[PDB]
């Protein structure tokens, strides 16, 4: 989990920014 946090947080952030573009 510790080694995957940064990668998975970045993926969560990328999806969050994409959702905001649809608005």
Closest approach of Cβ 17 to a copy of itself, in Å? Answer: 9
Phi, psi (rounded to 5 degrees) for 13: -65, -40
End-to-end CA, the chain: 33
How many Cα neighbours within 13 Å face the side chain of 8? Answer: 5
- Within residues 1-23, the interface with a copy of itself by CB under 8 A covers 1, 4-5, 7-9, 11-12, 14-16, 18-19, 21-23
Closest approach of Cβ 16 to a copy of itself, in Å? Answer: 7
Residues forming the site for a copy of itself (CB under 8 A): 1, 4-5, 7-9, 11-12, 14-16, 18-19, 21-23
């Amino acid at each position: 989990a510790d080694e995957x946090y940064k990668e998975x947080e970045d993926x969560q952030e990328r999806x969050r920014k994409x959702r905001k573009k649809x608005r």
